[PDB]
């Protein structure tokens, strides 16, 4: 299925998603460093299988698995700059999000 730019990403903390808008794009002017997520994206992945040791965790803490992987525009490792421009190209027929 089509990928998503939603800010809702699995396996991430709040300190990381603090720097993204409702659509999941880094705020203009906010300075970042390597590892930070600039554009949150999630590619749909399926047929997840777990070693019974991990299904045990799924049963114990109730932390359910997600049906989507993680591809994100994260700052290249070693460089730390400041966002000066953000452009959004939306295809035809694809509904325009808030940031767009």
């Amino acid at each position: 299925g089509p990928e998503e730019i939603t800010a809702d990403i699995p396996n991430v903390g709040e300190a990381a998603l603090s720097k993204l808008d409702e659509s999941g794009i880094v705020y203009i002017g906010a300075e970042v460093t390597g590892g930070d997520i600039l554009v949150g994206k999630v590619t749909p992945k399926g047929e997840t299988q777990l070693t019974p040791e991990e299904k045990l965790l799924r049963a114990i803490f109730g932390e359910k698995a997600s049906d989507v992987k993680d591809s994100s525009l994260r700052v290249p490792n070693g460089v730390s700059g400041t966002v000066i421009d953000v452009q959004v190209f939306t295809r035809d027929g694809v509904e325009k999000d808030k940031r767009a």
Partner: protein
Amino acid sequence: TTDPVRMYMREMGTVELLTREGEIDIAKRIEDGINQVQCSVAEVPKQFDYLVNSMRVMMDRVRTQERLIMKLCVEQCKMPKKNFITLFTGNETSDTWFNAAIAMNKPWSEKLHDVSEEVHRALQKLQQIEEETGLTIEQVKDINRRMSIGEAKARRAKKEMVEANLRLVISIAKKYTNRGLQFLDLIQEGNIGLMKAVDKFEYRRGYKFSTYATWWIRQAITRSIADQARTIRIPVHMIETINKLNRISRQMLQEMGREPTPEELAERMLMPEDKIRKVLKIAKEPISMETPIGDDEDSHLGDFIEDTTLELPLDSATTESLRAATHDVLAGLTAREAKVLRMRFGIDMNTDYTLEEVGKQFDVTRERIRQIEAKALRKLRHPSRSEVLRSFLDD
């Protein structure tokens, strides 16, 4: 020259062209052969072929009994071939020729008695055909012989027919050359259609064979392209759709000035618009992994491709550590709970088991098990027992 395309282009020069009498008289030879077959049928090509094959089947049935009796009376009994043919020619129906050969009283004459038992029943198979096909065992053979002659006439005439007009196949194939398919492939796929045209042409319609051969060869080349060009084969009608879309977008260039709006093709074309984007997304062709890369260097596209099926060792080590941690943790609970957890889940076991599956061999069925799990997970939910495992869940 060396290439085989030259060995073909200059080989077909030995066969001269035919027009216009040649066409008609070689077609008459073909029709004369098939007309020899037609009288032989007396005693749409689709049913005609079954009739032909049925005659052939009858002759095979007769020849089977022939060779069986022959092996029995010559190989297994040592009678001379002449003494077999002379006595067997003429009757081929009754057992009258066997008793005479016995009465011959030569040394082999005794071994006939033993194969008489084995030949009598083989002869009944052979004779029954007469009551089926209303013919004698000899007329079958004669009819088949004449019809084979007809086939031979048709064969020689048709091979000459295709050899004569071979050049037209190249004349047609040179138009299509560059469609991801090699040249000889095109000319051969056209020769196939040329043969199919030869077999389905009436020389009496008065038209020139050029037109019919042209139609058939053109179809046999275009459809063959659709079949064998793309590495990922595409349904035959989809290639037609792609060609139509490309033709429309080509024609509208000078109309729109630069290129047409996508929604227009859905208008110009018969198809609604939502499929056009799928038809354009489908057309992408594979890129050779040997494609040179930036800087025009030796690096190629077949290099920058990682392997993503693999799991990084940083995660396999964590898998093993979780294995060990849960192994130490499950031992902290009771033996009942340990077995229940290693059963409902596939821990240290062949496979996972369901509720009644676990309850089957635990002496107390479903609900009991449901009460143990929810309790054990509760007993492990508590911190001071879940910290080492809690370190494994990060979100």
